[model samples]
Target chain A: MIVKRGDVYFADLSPVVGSEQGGVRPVLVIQNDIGNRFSPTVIVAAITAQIQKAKLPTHVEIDAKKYGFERDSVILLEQIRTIDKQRLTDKITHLDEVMMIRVDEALQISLGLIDFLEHH
Target chain B: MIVKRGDVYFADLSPVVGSEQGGVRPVLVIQNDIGNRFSPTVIVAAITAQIQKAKLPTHVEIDAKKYGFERDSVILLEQIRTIDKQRLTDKITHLDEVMMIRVDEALQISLGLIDFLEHH
Candidate 1:
């Protein structure tokens, strides 16, 4: 069935974070304003890796509050700094808000990088 | 990598509360169901700020019920108090359910929030 507010769904932000050796880090923020209990943040490590023959950087950082992301956040950011200078610079230069509403199993409410940059 | 089920996320409900030396409060709610947990009810805060900057009142408060949020739910009554005063007073007379699913990342299969809300 279609996932609505309050429904639990998994969103893989792994594709956004491309693979590389090292550089500045990117953060993934997931927000759920549904129920009236908890709104915890999960930050994943955005590492650089070649996925699907493309040199993409993974921009998923674990939530510092829920997961022990204090040190990891710093490490991921540093890695971003080492590789893709352009993307890293853009991230630093622009504090944009990337909001994605997963539509189905395969499709998502993705605001591409270019649009994300233009709007925010 | 240590994200757990039945966990809470972030608490950045800046829009709930507005700005200008404060006034009444706003609302911002976030809940999760870990495993067999689920429910919906409430508002947020009672503030006035444009977080992080954006004019928005943010408040996080109470719940509705296990049924459709008809016009009978009292808690749901307080929210659309002002602008939607008409709609507020309208539902001020109705009530139903406001279900959600997702503790942290893990979701259920059977009586999950998706199964409950969507199919309904």
Candidate 2:
């Protein structure tokens, strides 16, 4: 099971507790390849159908249909999670550099590293 | 101008945009000493007076009185930000080892690194 950053997959995020994203849904792989290569768990952001959330700096909107989905999706950076590789069902699509750039910025905003991005 | 992890201070988070925390509020420095030593920017989580947010895993409640405030504060992990040193106004209080541990866990959950914490 090979997975890299920018790839989207359906993950089983069940047994949700404490307002965490739950159920099997689309998740965007956001962890670096170095960690993804060695760790059994991968970091990801949950994708939601709520486009309104895109107004926030921590959220990014993507064309879901381009990836075979019927509705547009929003990458909820606030709903990030780490799950086992087994939880990943199937590969949906891989985002290009343009989309990944936006994802990176959203990640920076989500983690309070926004200024660091500018410095580097 | 020296700052370290687990230190709380008042910072101007002015010109807020798209759900970012605003105003001069108590913010907890979450960046490492290495970064704080050389970088012009520091990463931090905005602290709020909303105790209700503590119900979420991403929110941590701290005794504001213990930190020299009139009421308790909630560390909003989801409201992380990177601001310049000039924005930092006054040092509030330093968090002890016990409180820092909880803050660390909340950070892990906020950044989709909850499992990485267990592995390391």
Q: What is the C-alpha lDDT profile of model 2 across A15-82, one tens digit per residue?
A: 54334567789999886564567656676888987573477666788886677766888997656655
How do the residues B18-43 of candidate 1 rate in per-residue lDDT, one tens digit apiece? 11122223322211111102211111
Native contact fraction per model = 0.00, 0.00
DockQ of each: 0.02, 0.04
Per-model TM against the reference: 0.19, 0.51
Residue A26, model 1, lDDT = 40
Candidate 1 residue lDDT tens string, A13-107: 22221222323334322212332122122211233222212111212332334432233232121111101111212221111232122111101
Q: How good is model 2 by TM-score? A: 0.51
Candidate 2 structure lDDT: 0.72
Cα RMSDs, all models: 18.0, 12.3
Which predicted model would earn the best TM-score? 2
Q: Which runs of model 2 end up more than 4 angstroms from their true locations?
A: A1-120, B115-120
- CA lDDT scores, all candidates in order: 0.20, 0.72
Docking class of 1: incorrect
Misplaced by over 4 Å in model 1 are A1-26, A29-71, A74-120, B1-28, B33-120
